[PDB]
Design a protein around this ligand. Structure first.
Ligand SMILES: NC(=O)CC[C@H](NC[C@H](O)[C@@H](O)[C@H](O)[C@H](O)CO)C(=O)O
Ligand SMILES: [Ca+2]
Ligand SMILES: [Ca+2]
Ligand SMILES: [Ca+2]
Ligand SMILES: [Ca+2]
Length: 323
């Protein structure tokens, strides 16, 4: 009977539940159940198994093309949101954005002090910055990081990765870093734990997770330099048992009145542009936001068009680097 909503756990899930899910469900007088997952392939596994239990799944803008093509996503209702309220391309026929985030470089202050890695070239520099690296066990932001470490300008990341030559060089660069990678982190909360325990010297992970660990007492610092500007959002699983109830829930939770509370404790940036006027965030709060003008200036946006074409190559090639 409950609409089942799934995200990636930890601080990020707690922020969505507190700001969006609990108030939207209360306003619609509906009951919902939470679940946790780390990859859209788990939703693909449900659809292919012939037994769908999830209604709404929280995925990334670059997972959307792959998931839609594999028949994992329901087509959303046309005016579920007003597209003018969200950044361009962040709302498709099968995806509604809820936030922007950064896949960025964090470093251990006990290891490097203020003299930590401030670029991808620095992150990949085991000679100037010796120590334990941690990278995601999934490729989005990881392949691009290698491309940046090779000296590719931020605005040319996907131009360099369009060639089979650049795609191979990126994997070779990750292969060269691989002996220095002590942990291939799987979840945002695990990444936050590695940071809190100082188990790693540097890490490429999500800004909200990093800020959360620092808030919790981690002696780490970070930068938006060379970070990938990502977009998180929601999709309804093809064959969702509570499809029309999930459509109603998704429409409600996308509203500015809920979106405004999304960064209250967790360092994320709401996607509904109308939320900023309602919350009137302080410049200090804005500085932690991935989509803040000064932060965007040193980042590059993830390109779903690249992932729509090269994900399978990336998934297999990156698995080998880790193995
Ligand atoms: N939008 C945010 O602020 C959260 C950012 C970041 N989300 C990245 C991912 O989208 C992650 O949740 C998962 O891999 C995804 O939901 C599972 O497919 C995080 O969990 O830390
Ligand atoms: Ca966390
Ligand atoms: Ca510490
Ligand atoms: Ca910092
Ligand atoms: Ca983006």
């Amino acid at each position: 009977m409950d609409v089942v909503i799934a995200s990636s756990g930890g601080g990020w899930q707690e922020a969505q539940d507190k700001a969006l899910w609990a108030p939207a469900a209360k306003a619609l007088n509906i009951t919902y159940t939470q679940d946790t997952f780390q990859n859209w392939a788990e939703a693909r596994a449900q659809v292919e198994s012939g037994s769908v239990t999830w209604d709404i799944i929280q995925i990334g803008i670059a997972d959307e093309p792959q998931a839609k093509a594999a028949g994992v996503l329901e087509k959303l209702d046309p005016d579920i949101v007003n597209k003018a309220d969200f950044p361009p391309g962040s709302v498709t026929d099968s995806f509604v954005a809820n936030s922007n985030y950064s896949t960025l470089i964090a470093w251990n202050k006990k290891t490097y002090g203020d003299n930590g890695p401030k670029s991808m070239a620095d992150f990949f520099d085991v000679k100037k910055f010796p120590g334990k690296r941690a990278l995601w066990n999934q490729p989005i932001g990881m392949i691009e990081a290698a491309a940046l470490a090779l000296g590719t300008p931020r605005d040319k990341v996907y131009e360099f990765l369009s060639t089979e030559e650049g795609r191979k060089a990126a994997i070779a660069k990750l292969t060269e870093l691989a002996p220095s990678v002590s942990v291939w982190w799987e979840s945002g909360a695990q990444a936050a734990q590695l940071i809190k325990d100082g188990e790693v010297d540097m890490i490429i992970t999500w800004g909200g997770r990093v800020q959360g660990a620092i808030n919790d007492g981690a002696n780490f610092a970070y930068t938006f330099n060379d970070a990938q500007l990502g977009t998180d959002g929601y999709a309804i699983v093809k064959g969702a048992p509570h499809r029309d109830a999930a459509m109603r829930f998704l429409k409600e939770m996308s509203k500015a009145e809920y979106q405004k509370d999304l960064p209250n404790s967790f360092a994320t940036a709401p996607a509904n542009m109308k939320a900023y006027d309602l919350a009137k965030y302080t410049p200090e709060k804005m500085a932690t936001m991935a989509s803040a003008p000064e932060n965007v200036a040193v980042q590059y946006s993830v390109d779903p068009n690249f992932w729509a074409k090269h994900a399978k190559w990336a998934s297999e090639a990156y698995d080998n680097v880790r193995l």
